[model samples]
Target: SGGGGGILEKLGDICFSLRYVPTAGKLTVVILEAKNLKKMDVGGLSDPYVKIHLMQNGKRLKKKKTTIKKNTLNPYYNESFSFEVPFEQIQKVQVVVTVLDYDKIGKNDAIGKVFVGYNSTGAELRHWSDMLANPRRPIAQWHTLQVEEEVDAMLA
Candidate 1:
C-alpha cells in the first residue's frame, strides 16, 4: 500500500487530560494543546481541530468535536467536553482521538490519530482501567499520533 499521501506527514504530540466523575457519571476530556503539528496548507500552516469518539462493543456511542482553530499549525485548545455514562459502562468505552486539518475547498483531512481504549491488556488499556479505579481525579498524558500501520503493530 502507498499509505497516506502528501508532504512532511508527521504530525506531532497531543497532550490532554481524562477524568471520570463517579457521582455524576460523566467522562470528562480536556484537550490542552498540540505541539510541532503538521502543516497542511502550502503557506506552512494548518487549520486544525479535534474529533473524539467513544466506542464500546465495536460501536460508536458518542462523538464530540472541537471548533476549528484557523491558520495555525500549533493550536491551543484548552477546551473540555464530556459524555454521560453510567459507572458500569466506563470500562467498555474507549476514547479515540483524530487530529484533522480543515480545508475550505474540500473535505477536511486527518493529520494524525491515537486510540486510548483496548479490549485486551496493554499499557493503553491499563490507563483506561486506572481512571475507573480512581474516580474524579484527572490524569494527563502526552500521546504520539499513531498513523495507519503502527496501529496494527499495537494490536500485535
Candidate 2:
C-alpha cells in the first residue's frame, strides 16, 4: 500500500519502504526497478550504511547499523535488511540511509527517514517529514527511468 515516486540521481533506481511492528522491530524493503540502475557508480561508493532507530513518544528507543554493500552494481543485489526491535521497549521505528562517499572526502549524507508502524502507507509522508526536519537540500534532481532507457539504447 506504499509507493515511491521518482529516483535519486546517481543513487540507482532503488527505493526503500520501511515496515515495523511493536513485536517485530523494523524491516526495510528496498525495491530496485533495475532498468535505470546502469549509470550508478556502485563500486566507487564505499560503505553504504543503513540505520534503524526505535522510537517511543517522539524519542529514540534504540539504534542499529548495517553495511549494505562492499562492491559491484546490480548483478547481485536483491535483499532486505532487518533490525530486531525489543518487544517491550518501543512502539515506532525510524529508518535512515547514509552512503559514505569515500570518493568524496568520506562525507556521509542523511538520505531520508521513514516512520515504521504496525500498518502505514505512502512514501510521500516520509518525504515531506524528512524535508521539513532536515534543512539540507537534496544534491540532485529525481532521475527518471526514461532517461536511462534512452542512454541504454544509444549505447547499444
Q: Pick the candidate with the highest TM-score.
A: 1
For model 2, the stretches where C-alpha displacement exceeds 4 angstroms are 1-43, 72-107, 111-113, 118-120, 123-156
Candidate 1: 10-residue stretch with minimal lDDT: 1-10
Clashes of each: 0, 1
| C-alpha positional error of residue 134 in candidate 2 after TM-score superposition, expressed in Å | 33
For model 1, the stretches where C-alpha displacement exceeds 4 angstroms are 1-9, 120-123, 148-156
- Cα lDDT for residue 115, candidate 2: 38
lDDT of 1: 0.74
TM-score of 1: 0.81
lDDT per residue for candidate 1 within 1-156, as digits (tens), equals 222221234677687888999789899988888877877788568889999888776666789998889888779998899999887767666787778898778878778876675553344555566677789988887766656455434433
Q: Candidate 2 residues 119-139, lDDT tens each?
A: 223543454344323333321
